[PDB]
């Protein structure tokens, strides 16, 4: 029976002798128990109550140590013995977290039982220095053409995803994860980016949908979902990106690469706000703690492409900031904007205008940019930047009796705008991304009707797949385009364009 | 299958009142006394091992 | 033998209870031995009752209240010497370039009150720059603070490299690049560049000395990096009698760090959050940047305006201390003009008929007027037609476009980077060059024969090549 | 309960020890806890309001807050001098 | 004001500019609603004033357009004239 | 320095008193006078318990002090200077608090450890002795700091026992075990 | 509701009103509790209080609960932190704009600002998706062109644009659907149109199959049958 098995497990727990350093709660309010006792206690040490609640000890005051309870006060009561767990925060790190949805401590909320954990490593640790750096050049291809050409970044690097509230912010992120499947399938572990999505303050149902979608795309087998759900309290939320980062260190340390998507630091901030205000610390600008900057700077500088000497590894990161009605002047955005190496800025008009992705590429920037990205894709997308630049300027000229020059721009530009639409949750293979943009570069798409761009696209890809799969394999394997390869490619495009 | 799952929960609640009964039995019996003496000597052994 | 036990660790604000009569003085430096080496706490209060309140410059995690503390007795004394040139040093004064222990003869306190009114120079002094644009429209000053504007994307770093190179030829001076809130990426790039541009020669000496303060490094250490750097510069100025040039990175993040330390100290955040001690902290810092009778420290600082609000108090306070502003723009870089200086937005207060000479001023004014008229003229001249220009007006347009090209120095650090041999043009010859162009003597040599060409002498050659 | 400045342990230790005042505290003071560019001094029971006091550290300050048991000088000068 | 707005069943905003514009007492009926409909309104007045709201609402849109002074169609100027009266 | 913190305030009085009387070394005497006045204060109800309830003046407090020195003719004038101080500080409410704290400092100076074996039962003397023996056997009683071990009856700690002393505990209560046991069988 | 969901097993549809009152109330007693007020005076525990409420409401393997929570958006500012926090926490948002009410349309909904967890592509049906994409574009265009019409005038638009404007005005008034609870308003009996029927009818309109139907014959009338009927009614 289930009754017998439960009894057996509980029955197998007996005998205490661990308790030593006691504390006694003086008063418990606000999840901030204040203890006189626990004389020798480490800072942010794990403490286990009589109730059993766990805490960290942010305030070590001369006569009281202000434990922060991670859980509910429902079972917590005043005067409680506080056993000293004796360990500053550490979390299991290891390969087992691949395919594991875990709560912050590491307790699987998908209940996938024991975790293959090769270390318990502290959660708050100092970031890779100047000396731990190698030149950045390793492509990060999200399977989104605009990202891959207009704003690409290298591995180990930051780049913000600052954009409009739940406009599939998670959707924009999710697209990348799916593209990482293609590389993941490949044996090479520089091509195995072991993704981590860090769900902060997110409904268990929402994350369940995420999990279900991930399972559907079989992405769970390199995915880790660090979960601090909405229900999960503000201490867990505070430590949630930091804890996640530590997991990342294990992969990185092994010299492997991985991508951690912190989603969203906006909810992390609020949790820190809750902690600070409750710890009565004076709150910073826009009522968000003063040293929230310090938190973010520590977190965001841990993403690093390590030195060849200290083993080439990386830990690419993509923080997500939720713009509160598109506000980018807000204190939490401004700080983050400075730290990040790139930004991607989603735009509401574009979303409405059915441009999905709704990325406004003008307000997207990369400070790593072209340093990483396929050489082939670089060749055929210098033009693209310039063309689009004109299209933006001549965009407002779209509303009469218009100059021929402007009108030519409008034809090329409008077709491009349609082209960078991509049905979300479908990424594209780079060896076929390069052809689509190439066509646009050769302006043969000028001759293709806007509605027929979509049909053309898939058809062109199939035409290339049957007719010129030599070309597709060449583009992929060479990773570079020779004049002869661009010649043949042009021929193929012309031929397809004719039909 | 639904009623079967409900029955597993129901078994736990059946067993919940069994915990209450067993707590009352321990606190009722002079096992309450005699096992406290056992706890006393166990603590003596534990604390002596310190 | 001063020892005390830690009696609080609320945040990074550690209150230490010290044995009686052995109590610190405010601004002492305390070192707590740790498996992290040491943690340096700086006494910023006495809470009395044989207890103090200190701030930390390092993280305080895992501390156990009651740890023994040892008191150095004053502001930390950081190693100094020409030895410390080309050494990346963290705030505490220890190698993070890790090219062995920093060899040093003397060490000196990081705080040090500004020189006396008597000691500070009573008359103007000009610092030369090989860049003609700099020397014309915003001449530097040897004690001066010149605040850089314009991104690292424009090649801020290359501009910074350029200045170090120029200084080496110009004086043979020194520099200290102090980087506040520096991205680990940016720091790597800079170290790699600095090695490459030979401003650091790993073997052999290095002009630039590096002090890097990464964003991750705590706000307290973020606040203290500048003062430490200043001491290093001052060792060069005061104790090696040599002109120096001290770069600072973002002074916004200097402010942010200071603002945080105020809030941590519990002090009422003054308007727009910024610390109530905002003004005074800049005042001390930028009066330790001065021309003494024995040296002069020039400092180039970077002003990261908060959403371009010059209106905000923190930029305003900075601009008060700043003497000149060099305003690099990307439009200029996009005109292929390197330097990237936006000539109608670069101004110095040492630009005067007295300070830099009447001739220099007049030449500058004419060139400025030319450019000013040229830009405004180009607005409707371009639209209406170039034929709308009068003979006089197109004389000016021709001269202006010739000047515009003439501005670009293919300078030495970027000899590699642009690919074109450098040009370091002396101040006397800069004035001379513009006088001749004003007399339109090279208004027979087309505008593109001055593109990426140095001074007057240089464009004699280019004129010959243009014909040939 | 409450923490009064006279309930400071150094003050208390003198008080338990009887009297030790009189000029020592009626016209000279001995500095207590210090920082924030204001100092809280014990004694100076005679002290003009906004008097100039000279501390034993050279620095001089202008008395701002005359409080019952303490005077809060404002330091006209550097705090490194003061201890 | 926020607290009261929730409590109440209507808001009767008066606009100062409209006071000056000459409605004295002034009104500002765009910021005036009673979501308890035509309840407690006399039956006769309910019948007559049925499209009074529509006319005024149309007038509000039309008047804004009229200030831009674009070439107005007769339909807008019917509204404009009606609204003004 | 005084022996051990007082977990802060109210002990600032105790510390001051301790060190002031420490240089006169009359700590035992002080403790005895405090005990003597404390006992007769406790055995006085109107303004011997309602003197523990503030509402008194400066002048009325002073006259209470005069009544107090009738309660003990002499015996440690440092705690008599402390009485003046407390009347002057206008609070005598936390008076027994200071007395208790001074007691802790005093018996720390003597070197005495205090312990307790809370149970809901009054345990055997054989049990008392065996635990006392055990504690002396352990390094916990370092010797020099004596052992006082008091079994107390607290029905709240129903069953088992918990030994407590020097931030060292062993808790084998039934309640805690029951709590854990029950909770996991609600899963 | 939990008792219904769990113990009775039955699915329900929860309705709560108004959850700004839940926020406002909590903010007030936070202050009384002495907590340092957060932004716009909101409780620091706002997030978790909202969160507990929302998390409790969920579809489980015991039931399904469909909350409809009224929210009052002070001064119609969703930039206000209390509405914005709730905006994240909910799954099927609806914005009810005053302007649209004033246009006389009841629905008062802002159609471009309606968003729902289910508002997919294939999951709502390919046809539904395409139709809705066309509706959204038409309205978005109409809104964009409103500025052009404002200064330049209506007449400076193209033929394609004019057809789009004509359709948009028709669609705008075809979104109008009478309600039973506007028998206390207008008296006009409500009309409720089944989902399949709406998808079909909107497709037709967009195709311009009902551009031969007057604008006011969509105004404050239901389904296609009604729209056609009111066209006949206006005609004679």
Could you provide a short overview of the structure?
This is part of a larger assembly, with 3 copies of chain A, 1 copy of chain B (50 residues), 2 copies of chain C and 1 copy of chain F (187 residues). In chain B, 90% of the residues lie in helices and 0% in strands.
Q: What's the SSE blueprint?
A:
The structure is cut from a larger assembly and holds 3 copies of chain A, 1 copy of chain B (50 residues), 2 copies of chain C and 1 copy of chain F (187 residues).
Chain B: H1 2-28, H2 31-48
Chain C: E1 3-10, E2 13-18, E3 29-34, E4 37-48, E5 51-56, E6 68-71, E7 77-80, E8 88-89, E9 106-109, H1 132-137, E10 145-149, H2 156-170, E11 175-182, H3 184-196, E12 208-214, H4 219-240, E13 244-250, H5 252-265, H6 278-285, E14 297-302, H7 313-321, E15 324-327, H8 330-333, E16 347-348, H9 358-384, H10 391-406, H11 415-418, H12 427-438, H13 456-467
Parallel strand pairs in C: 8-12, 10-14, 10-15, 11-12, 11-13, 13-14
Antiparallel strand pairs in C: 1-2, 1-6, 2-5, 3-4, 3-6, 4-5, 7-9, 15-16
Chain F: H1 12-22, H2 28-42, H3 58-71, H4 78-88, H5 96-110, E1 112-119, H6 125-137, E2 146-153, E3 161-165, E4 168-172, H7 175-184
Helix pairs in contact in F: 1-5, 2-5, 3-4
Question: What attributes does this structure have?
Answer:
part of a larger assembly, 7 chains, C: 468 residues, Thrombin, subunit H, Rossmann fold, Bovine Mitochondrial F1-ATPase, ATP Synthase Beta Chain, Chain D, domain3, 6-stranded antiparallel barrel, elongated, F: 187 residues, Peroxidase, domain 1, 7 helices, 4 strands
Description:
- Chain A: It is found in: Mitochondrion inner membrane.
- Chain A: It comes from Saccharomyces cerevisiae (strain ATCC 204508 / S288c).
- Chain A: This is ATP synthase subunit alpha, mitochondrial.
- This is part of a larger assembly, with three copies of chain A, one copy of chain B (50 residues), two copies of chain C and one copy of chain F (187 residues).
- With 499 residues, chain A is of the alpha/beta class.
- Chain A has three domains: 73 residues, Elongation Factor Tu (Ef-tu), domain 3, CATH 2.40.30.20; 286 residues, Rossmann fold; 126 residues, Lysin, CATH 1.20.150.
- Chain A contains 16 helices and 19 strands.
- In chain A, helix 11 packs across helix 12, helix 14 packs across helix 15 and helix 14 crosses helix 16.
- The N and C termini of chain A lie far apart (69 Å).
- Chain B is an all-alpha fold and 50 residues long.
- Chain B contains two helices and no strands.
- Helix content of chain F is 48%, strand content 14%.
- Chains in contact: A-B, A-C, A-F, A-G, B-F, C-D, D-F, E-G.
- Chains E and G meet through helix 1 and helix 4 of E and helix 2 and helix 6 of G.
- Strand 4 of chain A pairs antiparallel with strand 1 of chain C.
